[PDB]
Point group: D2
Chain length 313, copies 4
Amino acid sequence: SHPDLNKLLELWPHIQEYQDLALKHGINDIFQDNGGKLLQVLLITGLTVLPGNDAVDNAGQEYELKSINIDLTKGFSTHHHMNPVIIAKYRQVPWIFAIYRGIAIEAIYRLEPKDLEFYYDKWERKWYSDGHKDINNPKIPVKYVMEHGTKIYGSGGSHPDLNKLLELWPHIQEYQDLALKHGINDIFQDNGGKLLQVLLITGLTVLPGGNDAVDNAGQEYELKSINIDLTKGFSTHHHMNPVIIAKYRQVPWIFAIYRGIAIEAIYRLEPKDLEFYYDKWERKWYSDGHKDINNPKIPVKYVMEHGTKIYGS
Amino acid sequence: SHPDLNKLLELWPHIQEYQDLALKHGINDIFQDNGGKLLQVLLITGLTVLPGNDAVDNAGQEYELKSINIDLTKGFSTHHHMNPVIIAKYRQVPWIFAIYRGIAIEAIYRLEPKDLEFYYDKWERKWYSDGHKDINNPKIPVKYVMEHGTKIYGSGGSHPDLNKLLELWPHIQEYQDLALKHGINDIFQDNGGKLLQVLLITGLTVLPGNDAVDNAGQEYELKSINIDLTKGFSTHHHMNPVIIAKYRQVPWIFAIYRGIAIEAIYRLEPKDLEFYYDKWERKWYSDGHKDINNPKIPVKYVMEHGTKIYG
Amino acid sequence: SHPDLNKLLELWPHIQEYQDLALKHGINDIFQDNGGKLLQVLLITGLTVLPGNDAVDNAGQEYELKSINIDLTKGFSTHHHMNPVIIAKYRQVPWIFAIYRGIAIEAIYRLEPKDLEFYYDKWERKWYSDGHKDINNPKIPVKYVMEHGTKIYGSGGSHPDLNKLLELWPHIQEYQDLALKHGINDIFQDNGGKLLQVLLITGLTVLPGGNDAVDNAGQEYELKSINIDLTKGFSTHHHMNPVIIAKYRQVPWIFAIYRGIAIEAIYRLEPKDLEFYYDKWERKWYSDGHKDINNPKIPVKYVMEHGTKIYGS
Amino acid sequence: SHPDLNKLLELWPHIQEYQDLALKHGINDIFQDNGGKLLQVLLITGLTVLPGNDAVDNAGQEYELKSINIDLTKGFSTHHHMNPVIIAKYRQVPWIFAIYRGIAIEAIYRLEPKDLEFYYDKWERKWYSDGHKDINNPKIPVKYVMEHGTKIYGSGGSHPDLNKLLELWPHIQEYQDLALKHGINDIFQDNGGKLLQVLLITGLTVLPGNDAVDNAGQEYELKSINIDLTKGFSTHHHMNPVIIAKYRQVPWIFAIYRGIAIEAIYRLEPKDLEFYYDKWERKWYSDGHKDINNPKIPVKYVMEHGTKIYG
């Protein structure tokens, strides 16, 4: 019947084991904030993640941890509001840089505070050059980290759970391939592993970015989601206005409710069911002097009261 | 979209809790031997299943517990090989009769030692006269239990767990409806609950000759085992060269169960089973034209030569 | 404060893991019916236990399984009601004999139906010699099994869970030592691993067999237990009479309620709280013509209604 | 017999469910930062904790959430380094005040944006006049919240989970009483709930100078860490040669926590810590007669040189 959904179900228990392992190690969601990726790093390095600094080893030393997906960028980001209070903090600890390729760890580099000074100087000298102005997310090149860092290998310092991660790895690999077959680049970012569940359940195909998804018949949709244990309102648009609304009003919306890494429920609302929001938002736009609205929310209770449940109990 | 498989996925956490609930009450498998049914009678009556007497209450009285499905029969099966020695055990305990309709308990009756005296003594007369022979599966009628029995209702004597049961019931009902739609009569019998997972995964539907059919009209034999219990799939209790000739025409689907969940599905084509067909078909002739009593297909043969459909 | 109770708590999670592993493998209670011992055997041999025959291998062959604790006996028991319907059953399958030393597996022997024929013959020839009489639990000597059997070693046929059992083994070992320090010979027979919990909780010392246990002050007790999920009545005595009652009536009774391998609750009833039973049982003895009663029960509900809870919620 | 440790063992499965219940509601540790308390206010109010606004309801309104323990104080701590820029965030949201007494919620009040205007503007006047300086931890009085606030009661707006909470409460109460008896004021603060497991295992009782004492009169320092958070035990925020001289006289007990459960207990004698005493005591003199701000004892030092009491 549905071979891709069958595959998910058959891979699921191991996704759940991987989630369990991430939780044990201080990572709340594998399918969000590089959760499934950070776990590899923590297990290889022997590090304890901090919920100030990002991690601590068993000797009590603390670290800054930065990471990139080489498939997308070559610069490690830093701090959006770069100041000398930030910089003096930075000079106190070694840094761990992680280089992922897709969902896989490709390299880990350690830099001591002296190997980074070149950036602390050019950052605080140009803070003053421009007079008391905070820098916006300045980059440290991967090339620089590779040149001055000491690369870290799996070793005697790695956590015993590294072998449990290794045993799970092949199923995670295949799950990621499944996501990619369905247009999701990374199961461990942007709720990728959850979204895949939504697409397999609904039969929706994502639209490369227009609207978010399309069914077999050619009908298109806006597709929104929340982690219900974290929030009770669905996001819409950071620059809400009449133009965004005229696009929205032409399609049904799909609303996915995740709890943990699992899909709890899916609802569908037709354009007529959202007219209350379009109207609310247009008047607000005008009332404020033709001013864009910053991500106004649709409450899950509204969605549950007016929508049709396509999945859940 | 596959809306029936989706339905099972949404129902599953509840099916699991039901199963968890039954194992807490001494029931290993809700989907075999009326487990999901008996769970209702234990919770209604406040009874606990015993590991020769069937059940016990918190006050010590020990009971014999029989049951039937009204949809299919009117008689309460008793014992295949009963003697007049048995009847003295049968006689020191009130019996508890459960009458189910489909998956739901319809009525519960408690008859006392005094009320079965008509039947023991009819079978004790049966043994003597016919010539010291065993009465195969006698049947107490429902009308006899209804008439002489004391009906049991939900009450203060019911297990507090009955509340959890009632909250899970809507889901069990909906799961049962899904079964029915796919040609399975009873989730709580013959691995009914598991077979459905099989059908929704394979895209098969049970046939009212061959066991199942897909959308294209193609038909299949379908065998299953509970791996903790058996290692070889079964075939036919009276296998004859004509049964084999039907076997040869269709692919087989083999389901491996582990508890209430489907662990693996394998498909074999007619050529992968030729070795067995040929061996049984000849053996029949050799032994002297006599039917073969359920020869087995090893699970390892299926894993070695089949194509895995789910695992 | 209480170092032996502290030890239990510290060993417990692993007793629970061992229990989990036994359950996964078809053994309901590690602390009963050689549960923790049978598990070793199943894992070494690669066998699936049957709830007819005792076990099955992955090829479908079935077996009879017998076992002894060498510390106690040298004969494998068989069938209390030995008949030719029993014997012809026996001739159909190989037998696995297990030889334990305490809680540890010491040897495993396999015998084919021809290696046992000597016993099938001397059993059915003496069935008839005595005319249609069923034999009572005839013995096969360990010496005979060792001579004609083929000894089984850990091998490529063993279950992967054997290594998980090995990892747990040292904590099971120490738990057994703890039981022995408290007068319990075997944690895997006669609810030994549960009883140890009761003794650590109550501070009771068992009395070698008089009464069952004694406290520090010198007060003695009858000590009864049940697995509540299996039964609702406490056992008393297989040959109940006025003599057994006069002994009982002089001490308080301790009543342990196990659920699974854990202690759910402990109650205490004074002699005055059991007088209803003594009286009930004496009259019954006389009423029946001075006839011993076969294990009459005290209901757990009675115990809960009239006793003092020393442990539980 | 050890009747207090027994009591903890009987209570434990319930303490665990409570903790399971709090983590389901976004609370990581019931025994730290009033977790077991906040759980009550979230369930009472139907609120969900947010990962700058403290909480949200199912309808989207977002709130700021403050609280106090009436037993210890009358003022609602506000912010250590508040500016007049903050106050614009502070001003678009109704606040929710929780007043606890010991471990129980005594009253909940909801003040609206309009009702805090007296205080923002008093602090906005505080910043200007004194000379552009930060007001450390101002305090809104309880009388001010009681008087101008709208009290919140259990209702239809409460989480269905509140029912589970109420059924666990008798056990949490009894556990709290056990804590109190052993010198711990609050199970839901400062690892209160975990420290008790420590005391019952070691046979120690908290002192009203030294941290704890056994039956013999012997006293101990007692340090603990949550291993997922810290790897070095702490000492004294203003360590002086006289603090060290008290340290030298007693053995130390070191507790390693993992979630709500005690993972290990180690004891060190005064000779195993000499190395640290000597190094801090000198360092003090070297640096120029200045107090040491909480030097740490590594967990590995404790495991290498201590005697393990529980693990």
